[PDB]
Design a protein around this ligand. Sequence first.
Ligand SMILES: *[C@@H]1O[C@H](CO)[C@@H](O)[C@H](O)[C@H]1NC(C)=O
Ligand SMILES: *[C@@H]1O[C@H](CO)[C@@H](O)[C@H](O)[C@H]1NC(C)=O
Ligand SMILES: *[C@@H]1O[C@H](CO)[C@@H](O)[C@H](O)[C@H]1NC(C)=O
Ligand SMILES: *[C@@H]1O[C@H](CO)[C@@H](O)[C@H](O)[C@H]1NC(C)=O
Ligand SMILES: *[C@@H]1O[C@H](CO)[C@@H](O)[C@H](O)[C@H]1NC(C)=O
Ligand SMILES: *[C@@H]1O[C@H](CO)[C@@H](O)[C@H](O)[C@H]1NC(C)=O
Ligand SMILES: *[C@@H]1O[C@H](CO)[C@@H](O)[C@H](O)[C@H]1NC(C)=O
Ligand SMILES: *[C@H]1O[C@H](CO)[C@@H](O)[C@H](O)[C@H]1NC(C)=O
Ligand SMILES: [Ca+2]
Ligand SMILES: [Ca+2]
Lengths: 468, 469, 459
Amino acid sequence: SVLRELVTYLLFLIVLCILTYGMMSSNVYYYTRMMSQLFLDTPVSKTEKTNFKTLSSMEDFWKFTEGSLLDGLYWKMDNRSFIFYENLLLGVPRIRQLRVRNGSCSIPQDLRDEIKECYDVYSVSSEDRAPFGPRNGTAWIYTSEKDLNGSSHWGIIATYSGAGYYLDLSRTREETAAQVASLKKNVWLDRGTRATFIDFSVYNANINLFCVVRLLVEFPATGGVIPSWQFQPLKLIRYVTTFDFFLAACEIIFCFFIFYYVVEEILEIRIHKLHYFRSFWNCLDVVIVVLSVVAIGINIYRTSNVEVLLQFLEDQNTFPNFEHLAYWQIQFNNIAAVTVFFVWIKLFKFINFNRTMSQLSTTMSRCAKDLFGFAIMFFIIFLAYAQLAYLVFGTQVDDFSTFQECIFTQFRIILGDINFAEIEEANRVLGPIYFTTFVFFMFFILLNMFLAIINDTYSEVKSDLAQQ
Amino acid sequence: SVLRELVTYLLFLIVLCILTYGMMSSNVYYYTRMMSQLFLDTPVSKTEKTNFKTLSSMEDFWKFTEGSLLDGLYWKMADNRSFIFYENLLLGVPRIRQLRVRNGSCSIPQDLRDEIKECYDVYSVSSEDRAPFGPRNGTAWIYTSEKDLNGSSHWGIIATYSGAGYYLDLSRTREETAAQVASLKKNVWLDRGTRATFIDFSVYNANINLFCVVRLLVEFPATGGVIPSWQFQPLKLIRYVTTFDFFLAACEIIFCFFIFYYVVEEILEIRIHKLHYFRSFWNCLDVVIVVLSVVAIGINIYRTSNVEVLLQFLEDQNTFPNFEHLAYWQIQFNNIAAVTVFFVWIKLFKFINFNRTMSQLSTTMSRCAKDLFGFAIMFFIIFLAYAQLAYLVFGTQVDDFSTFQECIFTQFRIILGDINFAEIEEANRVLGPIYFTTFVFFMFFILLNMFLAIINDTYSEVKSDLAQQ
Amino acid sequence: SVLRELVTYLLFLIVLCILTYGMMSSNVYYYTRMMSQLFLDTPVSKTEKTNFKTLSSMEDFWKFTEGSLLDGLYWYENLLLGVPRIRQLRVRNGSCSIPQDLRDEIKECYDVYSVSSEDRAPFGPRNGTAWIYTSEKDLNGSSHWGIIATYSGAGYYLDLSRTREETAAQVASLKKNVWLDRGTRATFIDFSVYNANINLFCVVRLLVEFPATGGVIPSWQFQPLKLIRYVTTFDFFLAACEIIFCFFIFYYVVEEILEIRIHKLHYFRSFWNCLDVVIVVLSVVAIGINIYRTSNVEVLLQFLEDQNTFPNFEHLAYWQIQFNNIAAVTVFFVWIKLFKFINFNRTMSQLSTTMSRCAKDLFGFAIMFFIIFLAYAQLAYLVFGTQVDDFSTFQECIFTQFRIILGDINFAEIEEANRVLGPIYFTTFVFFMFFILLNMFLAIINDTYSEVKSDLAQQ
Ligand SMILES: *[C@@H]1O[C@H](CO)[C@@H](O)[C@H](O)[C@H]1NC(C)=O
Ligand SMILES: *[C@@H]1O[C@H](CO)[C@@H](O)[C@H](O)[C@H]1NC(C)=O
Ligand SMILES: *[C@@H]1O[C@H](CO)[C@@H](O)[C@H](O)[C@H]1NC(C)=O
Ligand SMILES: *[C@@H]1O[C@H](CO)[C@@H](O)[C@H](O)[C@H]1NC(C)=O
Ligand SMILES: *[C@@H]1O[C@H](CO)[C@@H](O)[C@H](O)[C@H]1NC(C)=O
Ligand SMILES: *[C@@H]1O[C@H](CO)[C@@H](O)[C@H](O)[C@H]1NC(C)=O
Ligand SMILES: *[C@@H]1O[C@H](CO)[C@@H](O)[C@H](O)[C@H]1NC(C)=O
Ligand SMILES: *[C@H]1O[C@H](CO)[C@@H](O)[C@H](O)[C@H]1NC(C)=O
Ligand SMILES: [Ca+2]
Ligand SMILES: [Ca+2]
């Protein structure tokens, strides 16, 4: 009967919960919190109160590189560096830059007598590849992406490739400071500079968990500095304790469960009930199995390609390249979270033990087609308002900089989490009109219509069920 | 057929969306933000923490003029030009201007005609001063007419200021501008008769072809104090530089052709067939769209064809570039285009009837609109009663109720819960809590639920009628 | 016949209200707030801008114990009730397994705190009791249930002196002969104050947690307690109110015993009897806590005059916190109990019948709502677990979602942590909770109401 599928699903849910609990080691948050506090919040020097989060010019960047960055990276107990007497610095950090070439744009002939140099926004088509400055070392010669073992990044202004002009720093402060001073003397960040990256990693042998740090600074063509950061914890020496073997056994059991589910679905689609996509539960099951096999493939691909870590161990005086592992770890985490959410949602298939739950399920299922139909209208109006807000406030308020940001801001307005001190001053007319009309139409019309649909559907289904 | 109208509307929507996405190019928001932070968030000097946004006295204005303004305007690389971020080229020279009133322009009572000798009224063209004052040397001490200055009104916060006044053109280097400002400060140029002050300039930033016009206004009300305001407006005056610009021009021509076709079709449909034609609510939307589109087209044509200011500036680049009319018309065009796009997107409801689910929803909305209007009349009458009570009671102490429209917006924010109850509780110990409690109670317990009652009754009636029939 | 019940309940309610108002203005919150500002707000030293609320390293703690702690403790102008105690909990070297892949550069490891990995060997100069492990039994302490772990009552302890010139010397000696090694995991500081200006005893406990990943985490608790005595007439009035409350609860419990003896076969179908028994058990446990506190309050004044001994007074603070928590829910339930009298009219009867006839459907829908809630909470925990600190633990995720329901979003950390799947989570949660699910509740009630009125017609 149904007991077989119920107990199978319960076992699957239990093993899934164990897997997520194991992959969610306790108090990993504090590790990244301390690292980010050390490298992000300390002022660049003892004189001014500027940190990495509030950089505003190239001079501030040079101060940070020679200031708090070296104070954080190098600690005193070629002796190794322990970040907090616990976090060992692996290899050497690397600093890279991406720049455009002079003449990427065309100055209008009207002003072609007072302006000589123009530089376009960053793009792979219009990036520089020629040597500059004292063309002697690595930092002054372009290196291709393939020869650098790099990939794209998808920053804030644009998406930057993995090539550029790079330099590997040293294991001691006395040499890194000299290298950065030499880079500062012979001008390295010119008007053509568009992006800069600083990468390193730490281990913290106390808990088997690496940490990869990447800091990015963007120089827009209109002047200024935009900073960004990324701290990512990883695990690459998995099998060290008994709990690790337990988690491996759980992963094997999960793979067996996925194989059983997919073979059952294949046998149920192959012959019996051809084109059985008329049920919501079947679509949920196929979505679950697709996400699960994608996650399994990602884990298999990213668990055997640890050649970078193996290579690093032989020569511990080089730069360890752990960016691909971090990217795939993030992707795997996203996929696993979505899969867990859908597996939990699947529990509704079995909660029909009495009349009340069955009635609630019936009224929830029967209104699923009117709610979608009205959601189409609701989102049409929502997107019209969002586009109007984007066009009106798109250059002054910073909550309407992008279309998606406009959508998120409109969703936050419902909760009552907006300023309105900037909306009114950005545009004194047509600013308040938008806000007032949006509030009136969302709160007094559309929500009441959702409520009316739900009320009518529930009453009708209950009355007809009782009558029959 | 309906398919022809649908495909024509989709083509029109695609062209319009292309226009909007092209008009918002790469992030000029950062372009505006860098200048705003440079000129507004910078403290006027090292030891004090006041900036342009928190000016509180005339001495603070003088500190700002000789302080952060000169620091931001002039940057170091014979009489070389200034690049604000090594990228934004300062165009010509900045200009400063002031508007003041006459002495004895008010009427004081005879009772206090001994302890009070001088009096200056509020700003008005009837009360403004036109006579030389102080060391009458140049244009800074002589009235200049609006026509001779090529200016216009502004519509500031307190009043609407004219385009005339006493003006001075600064220099291209910091050393000369500093001396000029010091001379203006020594000989008293800002008295208590001063009513408004303007600072204007522009930059180019050749990297992306986009000018920027900067205007800063400081108002001195007759009751004392200082009110600052600002305006940073990006512009595009050398459009045809790249192939994307030609693509946008072609799309604009296609848009004009679409508008012509739509107006021709509207004239054909209003000519003889359905002479009344106004009882559809879709014909009204169509004529509104056409009117807005033709207004936008006219504004664009009148704006792009009047660029002699740019040529005059390019003839001699040691003079003030006069670019405020272009910014004003750009703002007007932006507003018109935004409203037109909103209504065009709203027009999509004419075609979403592909099954029985959407038909009944649209029927419910159309049937309940006539009752929603009738109840909204009462709702808005009560809303305005509360707003006027708040304006008359808290309107002189809170500043969230200082103006009637501000009271309306404050009530709409109170609905969302974005209010500070303590600031109105202390303004009036009684009648404040009464106001807040009664407003919240009668807004969330009575007025909000009647809309639900009407909508639920209409939806149930429509659905039952359809099912029974 | 219900007139006697209504009048006795009205007297009980007014007695409880006057007792609450007596507890309402105890003016203990303000003293504790401005005494916390004395320790957790003043800069650690004249040059550094940091305080106890913003400790970030071992050096900051070492500067705190020689500085803002000492100057603010020996000088509002409160006096000590003995000697403060400082205790340390540490782990042992080699408590975890270093992987063989990279072990030629790492020699020692220190696992997170646990009873299994706790250290007990005498480290440093074996002079006194600060360098030798003493079991929990001799310390007369219990667990603390900290932020990252729960800590035992044992460890390496040292009692300071009543004179600043000697306590400073002791802590300087502790700093010189290194006491906070890499194995240190937690540090406790405990003391008590009187502040004779306004009679209010206070017990102060401060904790610094050293994670295995480096850094420090501070936490604090200040708890006030009183030595109430018959010094006026108002305190006598409250004493008479307390005796009246005891008589009232005895009355309620004896007649509850009678009513359960006459109808023991069925006693749980009615809802008001369950509320009544909850009220009486809460009242009896609260009064037991109060009598224990007032019986044991006679021992604390022995250390007031002069005593070079540490008073362990954490149980009183814990039970006082529990007493306040119990009193709040007691008055709430004794405010709800008021709802069974207002049922005088026909409209009130219809409303009560509507509310009573839809309890099972509301409970049934609560299960589905909580299933979806837990699914969303687990998704948020998996996505934002290591970045936002509002989702660091599962209960934090649950409470953050509850706050989101009441409109308490931040959305800055959420957006920064994950540029995709963060905004998706926020938008989907808001749309599906503010437009679909939470409405269903009302729908249920709505239908029931209609049905009720309908049968009136048929009646
Ligand atoms: C950039 O190119 C222009 C001509 O294309 C040249 O005049 C100018 O000197 C160049 N800039 C530099 C820094 O070499
Ligand atoms: C470039 O060449 C070498 C680096 O390989 C260095 O010794 C030399 O000083 C450099 N020239 C400069 C910095 O001008
Ligand atoms: C890229 O990886 C290869 C090994 O696959 C290595 O030899 C080379 O040095 C790397 N390039 C760098 C570190 O720039
Ligand atoms: C303003 O005019 C009054 C007479 O109406 C005169 O007494 C006063 O001195 C004048 N103030 C000036 C000129 O500043
Ligand atoms: C007016 O101009 C003359 C000559 O340009 C100058 O010497 C004087 O300082 C100026 N200011 C006066 C007279 O107040
Ligand atoms: C911890 O124990 C290991 C055992 O191999 C030893 O090598 C190491 O020196 C010890 N740590 C200290 C600080 O002595
Ligand atoms: C430990 O030794 C003696 C105890 O006899 C004590 O006086 C001294 O200060 C302590 N520390 C040392 C000797 O470093
Ligand atoms: C705790 O009480 C016991 C009583 O047996 C006493 O011996 C001990 O000294 C007290 N605490 C301390 C200081 O260990
Ligand atoms: Ca299935
Ligand atoms: Ca038409």
